């Protein structure tokens, strides 16, 4: 059910703790439409401990996307590197997602790319949020999160 | 000097005014460090008739590079425009190269080898990523752009 799928790919990369609680709550809040001030949330997010800049960006992005009403700290994190090759393949991924309509198609083709590219793709979409349907944008964030979580593992 | 080089290329893509003169007057004004608040200017630029949106956005870009008060949806909409794939591809590539340029004439000569839609696309990237390129190089870009746009007009 849409919310529950981004709610569990996003919540995934967030390190276990109390922060995990508040974020979930703000997630299902805005997903309902309860408390929709984006700058209220952005302010809270920017100040948060534990969360890497990237994680903050993915979260910013999602929030920006789920609200009905742009921050540098988000933008900087997704773009990071600005590695010419991640970028080149961000642009290639992006063009494919323009033709996409569903969360699942977007998600599937996104996982055929690198973590660097997906971060980059998001940094392109952040400033072009309308350029892709909402399901497809989420499918990007979820794919991004998923691979972040296919690295985080032991031995 | 660069500030007047930029000027002539900008006025190049604006029809005879004399809103044109209101514009030439405002570019000169900021370039001499006059009393200039970016918002008031952008607001005044947004509103303007006659000026096609792309023109507003090149202007806006140019002001952003030259006025203090430290984004604008209409400037961004003008430059990114369509948010079109084969233009972004060429613009991203141009973008990384512009990071490496240090001069005005270096940027200008590179950029003029790419197409105008890509050049507008790249100004979009740089407007979004404001400090990633140097002002001299950014100026080499807008002039590159204005030269392509204007030598298409005939």
Author numbering:
A (entry chain C): 2 to 70, 76 to 161
B (entry chain B): 2 to 71, 76 to 159
From the manuscript:
As the most abundant viral protein encoded by the M gene segment, matrix protein 1 (M1) forms a shell underneath a host cell-derived lipid biolayer to connect the vRNPs with the viral envelope in mature virions. The full-length M1 protein includes 252 amino acids consisting of a highly organized N-terminal domain and a flexible but less ordered C-terminal domain that are linked by a protease-sensitive loop. So far, only the N-terminal domain of M1 has been structurally resolved at an atomic level, showing that at neutral pH the physiological monomers have a high tendency to oligomerize via a so-called ‘face-to-back’ arrangement, whereas at acidic pH the N-terminal domain exists as a dimeric structure in a so-called ‘face-to-face’ arrangement.
In sharp contrast to M(NLS-88R), both M(NLS-88E) neutral and acidic structures are in a face-to-face-oriented dimeric mode and lack pH-dependent conformational switches. As for M(NLS-88E)-acidic structure, it contains two face-to-face-arranged dimers. On the other side, M(NLS-88E)-acidic has monomers A and B associate in a face-to-face arrangement to form dimer 1, and has molecule C similarly associated with its dyad equivalent to form dimer 2. All three M(NLS-88E)-acidic monomers superposed on each other with a r.m.s.d. of ~0.5 Å. However, least-squares superposition of the two M(NLS-88E)-acidic independent dimers 1 and 2 resulted in a very large r.m.s.d. of 1.2 Å, indicating that the two dimers of M(NLS-88E)-acidic show significantly different dimer arrangements. Dimer 1 of M(NLS-88E)-acidic is more like M(NLS-88E)-neutral dimer (r.m.s.d. of ~0.6 Å screw rotation angle of ~8°), but not its dimer 2 (r.m.s.d. of ~0.6 Å screw rotation angle of ~15°). However, dimer 1 of M(NLS-88E)-acidic is more like M(NLS-88E)-neutral that owns a strong bifurcated hydrogen-bond interaction between Tyr100 and Glu88 because of the G88E mutation that makes it more difficult to dissemble M(NLS-88E) M1 in acidic conditions than M(NLS-88R) M1. Dimer 2 of M(NLS-88E)-acidic is significantly different from all other obtained dimeric structures by showing neither apparent contact between Asn85 and Arg134 nor apparent inter-subunit interaction involving Glu88. Dimer 2 of M(NLS-88E)-acidic likely represents an intermediate conformation due to incomplete transition after the pH drops.
